[PDB]
Amino acid sequence: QDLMASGNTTVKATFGKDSSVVKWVVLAEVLVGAVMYMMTKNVKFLAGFAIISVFIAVGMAVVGL
Amino acid sequence: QDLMASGNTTVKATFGKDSSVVKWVVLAEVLVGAVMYMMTKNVKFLAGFAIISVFIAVGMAVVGL
Amino acid sequence: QDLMASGNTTVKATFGKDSSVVKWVVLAEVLVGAVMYMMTKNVKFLAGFAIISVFIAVGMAVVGL
Amino acid sequence: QDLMASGNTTVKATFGKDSSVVKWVVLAEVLVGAVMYMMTKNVKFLAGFAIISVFIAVGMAVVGL
Amino acid sequence: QDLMASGNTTVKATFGKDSSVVKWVVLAEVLVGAVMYMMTKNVKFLAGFAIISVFIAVGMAVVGL
Amino acid sequence: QDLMASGNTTVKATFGKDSSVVKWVVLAEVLVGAVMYMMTKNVKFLAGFAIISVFIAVGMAVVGL
Amino acid sequence: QDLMASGNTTVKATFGKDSSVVKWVVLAEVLVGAVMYMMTKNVKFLAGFAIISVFIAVGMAVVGL
Amino acid sequence: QDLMASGNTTVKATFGKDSSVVKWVVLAEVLVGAVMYMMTKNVKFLAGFAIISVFIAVGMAVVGL
Amino acid sequence: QDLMASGNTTVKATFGKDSSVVKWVVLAEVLVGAVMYMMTKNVKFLAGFAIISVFIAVGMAVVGL
Amino acid sequence: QDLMASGNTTVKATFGKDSSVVKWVVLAEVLVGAVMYMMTKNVKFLAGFAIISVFIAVGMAVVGL
Amino acid sequence: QDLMASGNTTVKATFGKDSSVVKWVVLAEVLVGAVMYMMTKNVKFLAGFAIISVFIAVGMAVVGL
Amino acid sequence: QDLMASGNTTVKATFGKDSSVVKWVVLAEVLVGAVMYMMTKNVKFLAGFAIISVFIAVGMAVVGL
Amino acid sequence: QDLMASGNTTVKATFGKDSSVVKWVVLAEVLVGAVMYMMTKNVKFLAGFAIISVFIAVGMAVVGL
Amino acid sequence: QDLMASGNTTVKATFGKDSSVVKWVVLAEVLVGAVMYMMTKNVKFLAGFAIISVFIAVGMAVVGL
Amino acid sequence: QDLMASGNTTVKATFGKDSSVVKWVVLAEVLVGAVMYMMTKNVKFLAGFAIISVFIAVGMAVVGL
Amino acid sequence: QDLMASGNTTVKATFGKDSSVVKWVVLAEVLVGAVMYMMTKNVKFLAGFAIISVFIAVGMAVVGL
Amino acid sequence: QDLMASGNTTVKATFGKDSSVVKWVVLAEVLVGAVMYMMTKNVKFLAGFAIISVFIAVGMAVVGL
Amino acid sequence: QDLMASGNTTVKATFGKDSSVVKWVVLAEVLVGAVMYMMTKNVKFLAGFAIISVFIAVGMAVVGL
Amino acid sequence: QDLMASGNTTVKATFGKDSSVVKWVVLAEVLVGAVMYMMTKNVKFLAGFAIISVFIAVGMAVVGL
């Protein structure tokens, strides 16, 4: 029949590829990496900056409801 | 005779390989891992991202009602 | 529907390309590098000085809500 | 079946032979070597300048998704 | 009888000699080594570039499900 | 008499020298080591790659039901 | 709306182009270089003496709140 | 898709063939060589003076974004 | 009809965006973070300082009776 | 109506920009940093010395009842 | 009203510009630096010797209850 | 009132300009320098021999409880 | 009328600024800190040694019956 | 009246400036420091050796029942 | 009265200037230093060899029960 | 009474002036020095060869249980 | 009378100077040290190899039922 | 009586002078040293190669059940 | 009885005098030495080229299972 947890899925809107929360993540990510680099002065922290984004993309693309 | 817990199995629809709940899981999984990585900056948390999915797949394939 | 974490986004104002916090970062960055150079006397630490800025720019441009 | 990490591969676009990041690398490479030479006045640092490029090329050619 | 963890093995597809993830690895490997060399200017980091690949190959060949 | 936990031993099939799970192990082992080496650039992590395998072999040979 | 970290910016007064701290830096810089030269007797250490100053200037000019 | 590190490339403006930083380099290069010659009185240090410039040129021409 | 828990909502006045309690929170928040930093000397604890505020704002804006 | 937690706000007097407690903080802050420097002999710990103060200022200015 | 942590401030006497503890600090500071120099034979450690003192002075002057 | 860490100051006697410990320092200082010179045969290590002494003197004179 | 818990207040004598118990506290405090330092060899534990005392003083002064 | 915890104060005899326990402390202190130095070969651990003693003295002098 | 931890003080015999344990210490001290010198070939490690001994002596003389 | 760590002192036999371990030391010492000299071709490493021996002798003579 | 835990003391046989368990210990001790040395390549781990043995001996000699 | 851990001692066979495990050790030892030398190009790592063997021998000879 | 780690010893085949891995080693050894010589232009790095081989041989001959 109907799976009862169905409907809704503003969950998607909530978490969607376009969503506040998503944008939140990389934001602080951008920060801390930039932060960390001051401390470290190593080239490390600029990756998931891009990577998590596409990482986000793929899993979002993977699941995407 | 008839096992009384039988019938129904919208349970399947509820939990099925295609189900809201399933999609829910990996979603937050994608999140927390991405979250964690900001904190950790270790390559760890991108696995069950894929793995749980196929892990889901196999057990779902294992049982599948 | 409406993703509930939406609205607000003074978060943007908070963290925006024009924001206090942003300006804070490079500031101390300028400092420590200048600091470090006294100790090191190597040409190293003048990079993210510029780079993080454009690094900031791109990610800000990348996400930008 | 389908390997779940598949799809996406804007990763390629991200890191591709033509990509920002790639161009970033050799850039600073050009710099530091030129920098170093001032200090050293040895003929050393002009190599991966060319070499890393073809080094990039080969590995890119090696993997290339 | 049947080992229950059997079946599935999109795990293979997931991790196979041809898989996204595999290609991911050497990619960043190519990067960091090229990165490192800028810092170090030592001939070190170009090895697993090739080596891990064949290292991958052998273990993949070793196990290969 | 008969030890009641006897019979079954699809447990063997489950965990046997030929089993999914076994193959699973070394797989991720191959990964993480290759992973680690990127970070470390030390020759460390290629051992149980082979060793655990024969380690597996011996204990499997040791017990083997 | 209002970014909450805003206001204040005695931070500027604190770190400004005219600030104690700024003047502190070059001071010790002048010292150590003069110090170092006694040891080294190389012409090295008189640079950021001027350079960091304009380096300070530019980044200060770059950010300047 | 779009490589996320793309856009921006004021990086170019930052580091471009016409850029402050570039001009900075050869400047101090001119200095130290002239400096060194006083000490050495060897004809050595007038090379990258010209050479690095064309060296700059070629790599800039090589990459040039 | 009338929901009996209705009326009142000095609850709002009690907890409102302008309320004692709200102001209480960030206060101690400011403290402990400043406290923590003495111990840690890490840049961590200055976030919800701003963030919780806008976090407060949004949820307050979200619900707001 | 009246939010019951209102009134009082000797809380302010307690924690105010002019308050014992506030002065307490930076005090020990001054200490430990000076302490730490003996151990470390790094230029690190003289920041929140000033910074927390203005950090205090801003949040105090942010909330300020 | 009255901030309850007020009064007392033998805390000042305890930590004041004239206080045992203060004098304690620089003392050991004088020691370790002199100690360190034996090991290092670098001119480093004679700074906060003077500097921390005025550093003490300023923060003491900054807060000074 | 009375700063509680006060009294005592056999601390002074302990560390005073006339104290065992003080005399200890320069002693080993005399040694290692004399030691070092055998190895180095450079005129370096005879300084704090005198200098630390007056360095001791001044800081002792600076603080002197 | 008369608050019945009144009178008595040998409670004061019991707990007073001059009381056994009070003296007990700092005593063991002196101990454990001295103890801890052996283990830690960090400068930490000598504070409430003085501080709790004045902390005692103030609260005693705060309440003082 | 009489504070009931009063009398006794063999507690003093127990913990007094002359007491077994006191002597116990510095003893092991002497040991571990001497121990540590073997491991470390740093001049660190000879301090509270003297210092804790006078530290003991002062607090003992501070409280002293 | 009698401090209860008193008596005994075979503790002294245990740890005394003449004791096994004491002799143990310098022994291994002699070793490791001699050991270290092979590795280092620096004149460092022959000090507490004598020094700790007199260091032992003084603290033993300091406390000596 | 009897110090409990007493007796035994095959420790002496273990470490004694005549002991395996002692002889072990100088042995490898002889080696590495001879080794080092091949590399260095400096007259350095033949000292503790004799010296450590008498160094051993004296400390052994110093302690000697 | 008779202490009831008495008799038995195959406990001795169990744990005696000659016992399996004892021999077990040093065995693995020999191993791990040899193991560790591969990793470390420091001369550390060959001590309790001998030492624990005599350490065993003494305590065994100390107690020995 | 009989020490219960007795018997068995295939433990010996397991770990004996002739045992797989023993042979395992030196094997990898041979490897890593040979490995290390490539990196180091120092004569270091060929020792326990022989030494651990006799080290093994002696402890084996020491305990040998 | 039977030492359980026994059997197997494809370990030998794995690591044997004739084995891939062995051949791997000297290979890269040949490389890096040849590499190094370009940099160094010293006759150093052609030794273990031969030496490690016989070094391999002997240890292999030493252990050889």
3-state secondary structure K5-57: CCCCCHHHHHHCCCCHHHHHHHHHHHHHHHHHHHHHCCCCCCCCCCHHHHHHH
> In chain F, which residue's Cα lies nearest the Cα of E24?
F35
Query: Cβ(A55)–Cβ(B64) under 8 Å?
Result: no
Phi-psi region of F49 (alpha: psi -120 to 50; beta: other; left: phi over 0): alpha
Phi-psi region of O9 (alpha: psi -120 to 50; beta: other; left: phi over 0): left
Q: 3-state DSSP: chain R helix, strand, coil percent, rounded to 5?
A: 60, 0, 40
CB contact under 8 A, E3 and F26: no
Contacts 24+ apart (CB under 8 A), H12-21: H12/H65, H14/C50, H14/C51, H14/C54, H15/D27, H15/D31, H16/H60, H17/H56, H17/H57, H17/H60, H17/H64, H21/C50, H21/D31
Q: How many CB atoms lie within 10 A of CB C34?
A: 23
Query: Cβ(R38)–Cβ(R32) under 8 Å?
Result: no
Query: Cβ(Q11)–Cβ(Q50) under 8 Å?
Result: no
Residue numbers after which chain C is interrupted (C to N above 2.5 A) read none
- Determined by cryo-EM
Q: Is D45 exposed, middle or buried (0-12, 13-18, 19+ CB in 10 A)?
A: buried
One-letter amino acid of D15: F
- Specify the residue for token string 């170092």: G36
Q: In chain P, what is the straight-line distance between the N-terminal and C-terminal CA atoms, in Å?
A: 18
For residues S51 and S54, give the distance between their C-alpha atoms in angstroms, rounded to a whole number.
5
For residues N59 and N17, give the distance between their C-alpha atoms in angstroms, rounded to a whole number.
10
Measuring CA to CA, which residue among G30, G50, G52, G34 is closest to residue G42?
G34
Measuring CA to CA, which residue among H45, Q31, B49, P55 is closest to residue O30?
P55
**Residue R9 tokens, joined:** 């001692």
Cα torsion S60, S62, S63, S65: sign: positive
E34 touches chain A (CB under 8 A): no
Contacts of H1 in chain A (CB under 8 A): 57
HSE toward the beta carbon, residue H52, CA cutoff 13 A: 30
Residue count (chain M): 65
CB contact under 8 A, E43 and S35: yes
- Specify the residue for token string 């030494």: R51
Cα torsion M39, M41, M42, M44: sign: positive
Instruction: Quote the DSSP letter at residue R64.
Output: -
Q: How far is CA H9 from the centre of its chain?
A: 18
Q: In chain Q, what is the straight-line distance between the N-terminal and C-terminal CA atoms, in Å?
A: 18
- Measure F61 CA to nearest chain S CA, in Å: 8
For residues I49 and I28, give the distance between their C-alpha atoms in angstroms, rounded to a whole number.
10
Residue count (chain S): 65
**Residue K9 tokens, joined:** 């401030």
Q: Concatenate the DSSP letters of all residues of E1-65 into one string.
A: ---TT-S--HHHHHHSSS-HHHHHHHHHHHHHHHHHHHHH-SS-SSSTTTHHHHHHHHHHHH---
**Residue G26 tokens, joined:** 């070059």
Helix (H) or strand (E) holding M46: none
Query: What are the φ/ψ torsions at residue D57 (nearest 5 degrees)?
Result: -50, -50
L39 touches chain M (CB under 8 A): no
List C-alpha distances in Å: S60 to N29, R49, S50, S53.
51, 11, 15, 10
Query: Cβ(A26)–Cβ(C59) under 8 Å?
Result: yes
Contacts of G48 in chain H (CB under 8 A): none
A43 touches chain B (CB under 8 A): no
Phi-psi region of Q31 (alpha: psi -120 to 50; beta: other; left: phi over 0): alpha
**Do the chains D and N touch each other, judged by at least 3 C-beta pairs below 8 angstroms?**
no
Strand, helix or coil for residue H50: coil
CB contact under 8 A, J63 and I27: yes
M27 touches chain L (CB under 8 A): no
CB contact under 8 A, I57 and C14: no
Q: In chain J, what is the straight-line distance between the N-terminal and C-terminal CA atoms, in Å?
A: 18
**Residue B47 tokens, joined:** 């696995």
Q: What does this entry list as its resolution, in Å?
A: 5.0
Residue count (chain C): 65
Query: Cβ(A4)–Cβ(B14) under 8 Å?
Result: yes
Query: Cβ(O5)–Cβ(N19) under 8 Å?
Result: yes
H34 touches chain G (CB under 8 A): no
Contacts of J47 in chain C (CB under 8 A): 28
> In chain A, which residue's Cα lies nearest the Cα of C65?
A23
List C-alpha distances in Å: J50 to G6, H60, I37, S23.
17, 43, 13, 62
Query: Cβ(C55)–Cβ(A65) under 8 Å?
Result: no
For residues N57 and L10, give the distance between their C-alpha atoms in angstroms, rounded to a whole number.
9
* E41 contacts: CB under 8 Å, gap ≥ 6: D36, D44, D45
Instruction: Quote the DSSP letter at residue J50.
Output: T
| Among L3, L4, L6, L11, the residue to mutate for chain M (most M Cβ within 10 A) | L4
Instruction: Quote the DSSP letter at residue L5.
Output: T
Query: Cβ(N5)–Cβ(M20) under 8 Å?
Result: yes
**Residue O24 tokens, joined:** 């143990």
For residues J40 and R51, give the distance between their C-alpha atoms in angstroms, rounded to a whole number.
41
* B7 contacts: CB under 8 Å, gap ≥ 6: none
For residues D38 and D28, give the distance between their C-alpha atoms in angstroms, rounded to a whole number.
15
- Measure H57 CA to nearest chain A CA, in Å: 26
List C-alpha distances in Å: E40 to D48, E50, F43, I7.
12, 20, 18, 71
Query: Cβ(B65)–Cβ(B13) under 8 Å?
Result: no
HSE toward the beta carbon, residue B6, CA cutoff 13 A: 4
For residues G45 and G31, give the distance between their C-alpha atoms in angstroms, rounded to a whole number.
10
CB contact under 8 A, B27 and A2: no
Helix (H) or strand (E) holding J55: helix J51-62
For residues S17 and S49, give the distance between their C-alpha atoms in angstroms, rounded to a whole number.
16
Q: How many CB atoms lie within 10 A of CB K22?
A: 24
Query: Cβ(K3)–Cβ(J19) under 8 Å?
Result: yes
Strand, helix or coil for residue I21: helix
For residues L63 and R53, give the distance between their C-alpha atoms in angstroms, rounded to a whole number.
61
Query: Cβ(G22)–Cβ(G59) under 8 Å?
Result: no
